[PDB]
């Protein structure tokens, strides 16, 4: 029953390719990242590269004490594995821990092994720039970054609302982290509050973590008192609660047995560019695959404390990749599944968030047509899935004999089953990411600003009336294991 | 505290033009929808139209002793009178009902008026078809229909699986209808099983209600065992349960406070054509504003009892106009409204299932740029829409300058606010409804079968970026009233 991260490599080492250390060297600036590059990172990451390994640096210089880990959700046959399902229903599966979640429940420090080291930033020696190795992901960065902060806070006026998100953070300082806060989303009203009285905000973030939590906190959560109900959907994952401990140096929770956690405030009234220390202009690589501009004006985290196990393994990622691709697009795909089924059930087959689109542009949905009715519910389910995930952009449809996980097989759909002036529809100014660089008044005269986008849906399902001759060739069933059993022993 | 049908009357009568009677006799044999279309059938309805009172006809020729009642519900503004909120508000306001039913109640058989006369169908002299006028809207309908009739039924193997429904029912025998069952509705799974046994399945047929339930019984409900759970958006509206009684000739329960109950059997393995009768290939007037075509295969009612109060009134409808608006509409904007809200929170300010669309194939909704990220929201606002009614066929998207209750101003926004090759999108092939005869593929070569339809949305808001060359010409607040009060009396 896995519990925390290190309960998780141990499953991971079970099983051949899953998990690799290497003992060799490496430079947390930009080296670690371009080696990863090589044997995981995948996605949209330039090529070559590939689904691979979670992998372990043991060795990382001017930090002698410090391991750093990457790509542990980095490819969807893995974080299949690491929960115990089969990667075609990984969204489902997920799904019913979000609908029966169980909560999360509080331990004492002496059951809190993210306490076993506790330095407080009140030391004079302490320097958060050389206790923690944080990965520079491209020469052309903001800074060191750590990835995947899961991020713990409360309204400062009402203290039952909780919220449990995952963030990034470039190290700014001594003491100091910048960090982006999305428009409108929890704990940054949170922190709009605190500021308004001119008072800090309270934070734990929370990183190297059972790939249950950091998989169930992407998805949206219903809000009950106390709840940090995002951690439900973990504990139903587990069937275990997710323990939260009581912050040493501020007055919030932190995940009990995470490997690092950062305990500090967001300060009122102060701002920092997010490159002040490179001028580099840009902040790190964004998933759809180009380095993001340098935000100007960011929120800081003021550290009060860096709690972690003996041993800490520090955990990020490279790409960010097919990690991305997992930890975004699994809620993607839950949200597009419940959407459509509950309009028309029994339609959609599947819906993948394409790695193509890091999990949150791309939706290919495998259809069914069962009946002549069928014929336009395809359009139907589109106009579901652009409607329930707005960050959407293109959508690729196609019936339940294409294999919408192989991209060769979507593009064959492409080419014998569309005809570019019927099957392609076009929907202008609509928004949807500022982060897609096509999205914007330059690219395209109906854009209004950036992030706004036409929206193409890709209709690829055969028309209902000529489906009796697009039966795909039809070769005969066959265990072809008897004819060569060594062969398909590599599986 | 409006309890029944006639409670519902009573209100109406203290408003001026709300409810109006007649004693001049009428055929309900087309006369009568012949009449109401002047006087306040609306809606779809060909013109001349108008929104209007509701209307009993007290003088039924064939029937001395009967009186017909309709456009109940055929007003916006009378239905937020009947339900004591504004007319603006009214899908939030039944929406607030759906989300804290109250259970209905079972009270004993003298507590229900319905069950004041008794007509059971043994006795010799029994003919449905004398006992009770049924209207004909058109000439060329299928037959006489009774087109409010909400439908209780239980599942027959589980007694606690209920359901509530609204149905039209032509009148076929001296004690049989024909009932349309939309497929995959409980009802109708019910009636399946029941068949596939061979066996009837017990219904009621409950005519001449509150308001409230009508209006809440077209929302979705979720199921609870026992549960008749549509009522519970009346019971709340109220705030008070809604009553039942147990048939005196089925089991199965009825409205304890309805007009008029028709007690009866869906038969097994028994199918009818609609048009028996009269070949005339229709049904009857279907929401768009056309003749729907006859039903050449319905199961069949047989009525074993029909119970009604004393001085019965006969409830139905005509046009359907715009009682159909407000009966599918109100649950159409109720359901736009809760996707946008929980999608993008703050931006919509209100939706309309316009009238001109039967209250569904046509949506205004009306929006506020709040910041530069809501410019491209508009068209999501449009997609929510679309996915979440798929009956929808275009939406019309405006300000929060623009009356969506008021068509001028919306031709005014498609007029100033809107240029024809950047403000419309089209989205061909996505099946809509085949009650709009142009789904067809005869009318366009996108369309592959009938009930497919090209969607357009319509963008009729201002571009962000230029909404200071579009402030509307800024007339001074004034009270007005004291300038003219008797005509403000009015």
């Given at each position: ?5 290190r ?20 430079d ?60 075609s ?12 979640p ?8 002496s059951?809190?092994?993210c ?15 050389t ?76 990183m ?24 439900g ?17 501020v007055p ?26 490179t ?32 041993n800490?393994?520090?955990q990020?990622?490279?790409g ?50 069962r ?31 294409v294999?919408?996980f ?12 569309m ?19 096509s ?26 009336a ?26």
């Amino acid at each position: 029953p896995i519990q925390d991260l290190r309960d998780a490599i141990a499953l991971l080492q079970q099983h051949d390719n899953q998990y690799l250390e290497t003992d060799h060297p490496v430079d947390p600036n930009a080296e670690l990242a371009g080696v990863y590059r090589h044997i995981g990172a995948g996605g949209t990451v330039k090529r070559p590269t590939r689904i691979g390994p979670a992998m372990m640096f043991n060795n990382i210089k001017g930090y002698p004490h410090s391991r750093i880990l990457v790509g542990m959700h980095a490819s969807r046959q893995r974080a299949a594995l690491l929960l115990g399902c089969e990667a075609s229903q990984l969204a489902l599966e997920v799904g019913k821990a979000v609908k029966k979640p169980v909560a999360p429940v509080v331990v004492p420090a002496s059951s809190a092994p993210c306490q076993e080291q506790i330095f407080l930033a009140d030391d004079p020696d302490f320097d958060l720039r050389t206790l923690l190795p944080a990965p520079t992901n491209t020469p052309i960065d903001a800074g060191p970054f750590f990835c995947l902060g899961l991020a713990l806070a409360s309204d400062p006026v009402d203290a039952s609302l909780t919220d449990v998100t995952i963030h990034r953070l470039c190290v700014q300082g001594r003491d100091e982290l910048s960090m982006f806060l999305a428009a409108g989303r929890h704990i940054e009203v949170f922190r709009q509050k605190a500021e308004a009285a001119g008072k800090p905000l309270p934070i734990t973030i929370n990183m190297g973590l059972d790939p249950a939590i950091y998989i169930g906190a992407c998805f949206e959560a219903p809000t009950t008192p106390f709840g940090y109900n995002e951690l439900g959907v973990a504990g139903a994952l587990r069937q275990r609660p997710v323990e939260l401990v009581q912050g040493v140096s501020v007055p919030e929770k932190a995940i009990a047995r995470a490997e690092i956690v950062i305990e500090g405030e967001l300060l009122p009234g102060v701002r920092v560019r997010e490159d002040q220390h490179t001028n580099s202009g840009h902040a790190m690589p964004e998933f759809p695959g180009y380095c993001g501009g340098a935000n100007p004006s960011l929120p800081v985290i003021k550290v009060k404390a860096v709690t972690m196990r003996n041993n800490a393994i520090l955990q990020t990622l490279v790409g960010p990749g097919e990690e991305h691709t997992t930890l975004a697009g699994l809620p993607t795909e839950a949200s597009i599944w419940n959407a459509v089924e509950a309009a028309i059930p029994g339609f959609l087959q599947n819906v993948y968030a394409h790695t193509a689109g890091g999990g949150k542009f791309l939706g290919i949905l495998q259809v069914k047509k069962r009946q002549p009715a069928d014929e336009g519910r395809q359009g139907q389910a589109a106009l579901l899935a652009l409607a329930t995930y707005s960050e959407l952009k293109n959508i690729i449809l196609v019936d339940e004999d294409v294999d919408i996980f192989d991209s060769d097989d979507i593009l064959w759909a492409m080419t014998t089953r569309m005809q570019g002036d019927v099957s392609i529809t076009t929907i202008p100014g609509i928004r949807g990411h500022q982060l897609d660089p096509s999205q914007t008044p330059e690219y395209s005269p109906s854009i209004r600003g950036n992030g706004i986008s036409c929206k193409t849906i890709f209709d690829c399902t055969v028309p209902w009336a000529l489906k009796s001759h697009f039966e795909r060739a039809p070769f005969a069933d066959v265990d072809p294991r008897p004819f060569a059993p060594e062969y398909f022993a590599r599986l």
